[PDB]
Amino acid sequence: TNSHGEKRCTRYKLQKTVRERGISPVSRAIQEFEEGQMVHIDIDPSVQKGMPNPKFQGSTGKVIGQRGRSYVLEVRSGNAMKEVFSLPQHLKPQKY
Amino acid sequence: KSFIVKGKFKAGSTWEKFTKKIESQNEKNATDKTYSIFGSKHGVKRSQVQIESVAEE
Amino acid sequence: KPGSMYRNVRQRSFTRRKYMGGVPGSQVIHYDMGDKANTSFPVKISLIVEEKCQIRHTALEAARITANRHLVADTGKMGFYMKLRVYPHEVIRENKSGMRRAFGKNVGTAARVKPMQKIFTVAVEKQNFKAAKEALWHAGQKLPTPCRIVVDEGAELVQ
RNA sequence: UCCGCUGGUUCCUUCCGAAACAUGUCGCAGCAUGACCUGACUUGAGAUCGUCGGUGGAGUAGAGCACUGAUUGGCGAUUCCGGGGAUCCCUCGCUCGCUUGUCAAACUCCAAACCCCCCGUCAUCCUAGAAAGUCGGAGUCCGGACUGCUGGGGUAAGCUUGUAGUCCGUAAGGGAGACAACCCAGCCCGUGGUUAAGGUCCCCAAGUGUCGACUAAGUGUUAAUACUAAAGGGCGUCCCAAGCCCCAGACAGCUGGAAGGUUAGCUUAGAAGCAGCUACCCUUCAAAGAGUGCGUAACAGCUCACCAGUCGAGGUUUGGGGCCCCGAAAAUUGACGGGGCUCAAGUCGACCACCGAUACCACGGAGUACCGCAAGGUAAUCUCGUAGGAAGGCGUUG
RNA sequence: GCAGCUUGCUACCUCGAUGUCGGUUCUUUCCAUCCUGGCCGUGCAGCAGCGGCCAAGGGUGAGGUUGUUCGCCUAUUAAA
Ligand SMILES: [Mg+2]
Ligand SMILES: [Mg+2]
Ligand SMILES: [Mg+2]
Ligand SMILES: [Mg+2]
Ligand SMILES: [Mg+2]
Ligand SMILES: [Mg+2]
């Protein structure tokens, strides 16, 4: 039977480009966001902790608040709203 | 009424050339006659019988 | 089994050796024929395919044998250089219960082709061109697809 | 008695109108919860079925060998890990590099078109109430088919199991010979008009229509289609291109020539050009040969190849195309829908006129939705319908 | 490639019933020809063979074992 764990079908989803593997840039981890500021979900495989479920890959949410070193996002899946915790290392601003 | 026609048509999976001489009262009818004759002879339509020149002879 | 059982391309490829098991060997022994060390044949003709299909290795072996016999009989042992191109990488499986767990098991090997894709190639002199055409026409008779002959190099010489 | 299993369940109109799917189940002919349908109420301003531009997600098609596995020969060496036959006398496969020829669903240095989230813009809906929320009533969890995905499996199947769109189910009317789901069209009633699909020799309304060619087989006269035969061949016929010889003369014939030497090497006697080595048997003349055949123990002439005189205009080799022919045999009598059809009533490329729906236009009428105190106003953006929800009426006895 | 005459594959119709195998009787259809009619080739002297083409008008039987179809065997026969 097929499994239904939390990392299924992520062979290429959670990979790094060949000229990207290793230590990722550190400035991406100290970026700071404010309220109501659209961001993009782009999971960085190099960081093991604070990773949202990879089904939210490539979605855009808005910041709602901060809990420690993690921002609270508001992502739409289908017709629902899902609140996703993610460290700022996996996030990326929207360029207007 | 004599005329000269030159062009290329898609015979099968390749491009050929022709120099048919068609009798006709004028030149537009010469082009039409060329198209009709090629349709009769090779089953092609008016999209693979590109006529380069219909110069009078 | 009959030839038409495994000749159409309807399903995905199935070629990874390390996952399947027990693929039987092949019969075709040598893929180069004739004078390999020569490189000065001015005419280079070849047999091409008019439709996608699968060719069993046995058909390729029969075609190679017949072309070899004809070419050696007429042109000579040192007057040509034949070279087969397509190698059989596909695998053929035959179910053998009914439809209960109908997935098959390996029975042979096949080589897929594509339209206008060269299969054989013969190089000869100017005096043995007709013999080359005569040889390549029999080889295409054992082959499971319509085939036409194209003179690739030295077309102005022969034509 | 009980059953999740079979049969039956009685009047009219009006408004709206599905699911044959997911999870759990001693669950698979059942049921619960959710998706989908319907009625009412609360709140009070936005929403996104669509277009364009941008910030992002790609790892599929295709393509390729840069990783992982395979794969074809040539060349140069591994002075190994190796098999062939006391200096391992030396052969040398596996292997490592340069070049050639193939691959991949569980390969990728590459890499689309669809598609998804968000921002701006246009566009449509909306105070006659967007988005959201609360409560009442359900049906449904036997599906099927067509067009795409070379979908997966299977020899294949009107097979089985997926996915996107649209349909039948529950869809009239027009056309396909008849046709659940194919083409036009989604339908209140009556009258007039013009068209769509499709057709115009007769059956059958409207063309024995026009222009240019092809087919000689009754081939064909069959959009899709579960209903239509293949490889191979044709000096059958209609076209295009490319070479070669050519009126001081090309091809088919009329002619003879093919004489020098030889009776080639040959043992059987003899395979004397035609069992078996060779070579152009003539310095030389068109011709003259080691040469096919009637003949041929051997031959021999007759003469093959091969040229020469002769007529008197085109001849010849190949490649790519259209139609047709052979390949092609089944059981009641018979299926282009039928009659029949040959410069067509068939095929190919174009064109003109007309016929033909409930579609579209106009007029009159009914009902409905919403608003308005009423009178009445708006409706291209209202009128199909099974399970089912809701509203108003008719009838029988008291 | 053709046929659907062997066995498979599928589950489209029939479970408020479409009465199974073999033989017997009687009628008919197909040709992919066993004999009878006509032709062609031969490594066809004659006789008799071998191979192929047209042709479905007529014929294609009697018995022993076995439930058998199928198949084996016997003596005839133009062929059984
Ligand atoms: Mg690919
Ligand atoms: Mg139920
Ligand atoms: Mg449809
Ligand atoms: Mg419908
Ligand atoms: Mg209808
Ligand atoms: Mg109802």
UniProtKB/Swiss-Prot annotation, chain A:
InterPro entries: Ribosomal_eL21 (IPR001147), Ribosomal_eL21_arc (IPR022856), Ribosomal_eL21_CS (IPR018259), Ribosomal_eL21_sf (IPR036948), Translation_prot_SH3-like_sf (IPR008991). One of its GO terms (cellular component) is cytosolic large ribosomal subunit. Keywords: Ribonucleoprotein, Ribosomal protein. GO terms for molecular function: structural constituent of ribosome. PROSITE patterns: RIBOSOMAL_L21E. GO terms for biological process: translation. The keyword ATP-binding does not apply. Pfam families: Ribosomal_L21e. Belongs to the eukaryotic ribosomal protein eL21 family. HAMAP family: Ribosomal_eL21 (MF_00369). This is Large ribosomal subunit protein eL21.
Swiss-Prot record, chain B:
SUPFAM superfamilies: RplX-like. Pfam families: Ribosomal_L18A (PF01775). Gene3D superfamilies: 3.10.20.10. InterPro entries: Ribosomal_eL20 (IPR028877), Ribosomal_eL20_dom (IPR023573). One of its GO terms (molecular function) is large ribosomal subunit rRNA binding. One of its GO terms (cellular component) is ribosome. Keywords: Ribonucleoprotein, Ribosomal protein, RNA-binding, rRNA-binding. Disulfide bonds: none annotated. Transmembrane segments: none annotated. One of its GO terms (biological process) is translation. Belongs to the eukaryotic ribosomal protein eL20 family. Part of the 50S ribosomal subunit. Binds 23S rRNA. NCBIfam families: PRK00773.1-1. This is Large ribosomal subunit protein eL20. The gene is rpl18a.
UniProtKB/Swiss-Prot annotation, chain C:
One of its GO terms (cellular component) is cytosolic large ribosomal subunit. Transmembrane segments: none annotated. The keyword Ribonucleoprotein applies. It holds the Pfam family Ribosomal_L16. Keywords: Ribonucleoprotein, Ribosomal protein. InterPro entries: Ribosomal_uL16, Ribosomal_uL16_arc, Ribosomal_uL16_CS_euk_arc, Ribosomal_uL16_dom, Ribosomal_uL16_euk_arch, Ribosomal_uL16_sf. One of its GO terms (molecular function) is structural constituent of ribosome. GO terms for biological process: translation. It comes from the Archaea. The keyword ATP-binding does not apply. PROSITE patterns: RIBOSOMAL_L10E. NCBIfam families: PRK04199.1-3, PRK04199.1-4, uL16_euk_arch. Belongs to the universal ribosomal protein uL16 family. This is Large ribosomal subunit protein uL16. It comes from Methanosarcina acetivorans (strain ATCC 35395 / DSM 2834 / JCM 12185 / C2A). The lineage of its organism: Archaea, Methanobacteriati, Methanobacteriota, Stenosarchaea group, Methanomicrobia.
